[PDB]
Symmetry: C2
Subunit: 201 residues, 2 copies
């Protein structure tokens, strides 16, 4: 068996959007990459915005599922330990799935009104990790200048800024990420230890 036509199209989309970005990618080129009549993208996806949106939901629901597995198991850990170990796993995923990684980072090139739609539709699923951190922070010996709110904000921006930075620095260059991996991992351990120390009593 081969992929269904819709999955052949999502795969080509993930590859061409990640290679060219949203504006430069053409649906003809995605159709030719998927080995389907040009017509078939209209049939399944309506327009180029919708193809992009469904491919982002499709890749991100794969991630969300990796995440719930990790959550379900590592729930009882110290949150900083939880984060370092989650970041390592994301690094490893990005290196083993470079096309997906390159595609995820394109969210920034798109018109504000497609990125906004995506962020609305992702909010519920991003909120699972977010709501988990918030709860764990109550088990935290914090410091009389550091609100739980600043602590939550600093940690989330750390966690999602880090991701953005490496996806961009290593875009198209998986072997270099694999070469820098355990240096990156080690830098991350120390940076979370700086936050923990600066944040707590």
């Amino acid at each position: 068996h081969m992929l269904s036509k819709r999955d052949a199209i999502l795969k080509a989309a993930v590859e061409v959007f990640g290679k060219k970005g949203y504006d430069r990618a053409t649906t003809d080129e995605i159709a030719e990459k998927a080995g389907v009549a040009k017509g078939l993208i209209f049939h399944y996806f309506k327009n180029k915005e919708e193809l992009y949106y469904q491919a982002y939901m499709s890749v991100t629901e794969k991630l969300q599922k990796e995440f719930e597995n990790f959550l379900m198991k590592n729930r009882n850990r110290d949150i900083f330990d939880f984060m370092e170990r989650w970041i390592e796993k994301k690094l490893e995923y990005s290196a083993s799935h470079p096309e997906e990684a390159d595609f995820l980072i394109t969210l920034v090139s798109v018109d504000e009104g497609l990125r906004k739609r995506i962020l609305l539709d992702l909010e519920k699923s991003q909120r699972v990790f977010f709501d988990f951190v918030r709860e764990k922070l109550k088990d935290l010996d914090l410091a009389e200048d550091v609100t739980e709110e600043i602590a939550l904000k600093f940690l989330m921006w750390f966690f999602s800024g880090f991701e953005e930075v490496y996806l961009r620095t290593y875009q198209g260059k998986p072997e270099l990420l694999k070469r820098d991996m355990n240096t990156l991992v080690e830098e991350v351990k120390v940076m979370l230890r700086i936050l923990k120390k600066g944040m707590t009593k």
Copy 2:
């Protein structure tokens, strides 16, 4: 007197690139906004990539100059104090120059080979602040797990991630930045105090 034709074109460019981004902006629309024959953009700028590159160099040399003024004067300060106070000043600049701000943040939408060119050509001028931080970090009581290198890396990513985040969150919405200013400033003070504490003895 009015602006020179080249400055009328750079101003329109800054506005249309910041409004539409690099790919969607047309040079015809910039010419019409600048009130110049369509031909005149070719005459001064050659192509759309070159217009974009010269407008980024033009806005960024304005910034660099603000920066050297601040540097020249605040050179003797504690680096964390120096940074908080520099970030406040950048916030205030962004609120009073929203079109420039919106334009700077578009650097990410452009083809890798135009952003790369820009980063090469900016490296020398970004390195002034970078080389200053590096030096001040030697006057720092650091902690036996924190290399000057991780400390430099954490601080620079803090400083330039913060910027990216607010330019994006407040894109097109200057009144909201002005409304959130002194809350943002206060969050920043506390986050740099977390870094200082986590980073030092």
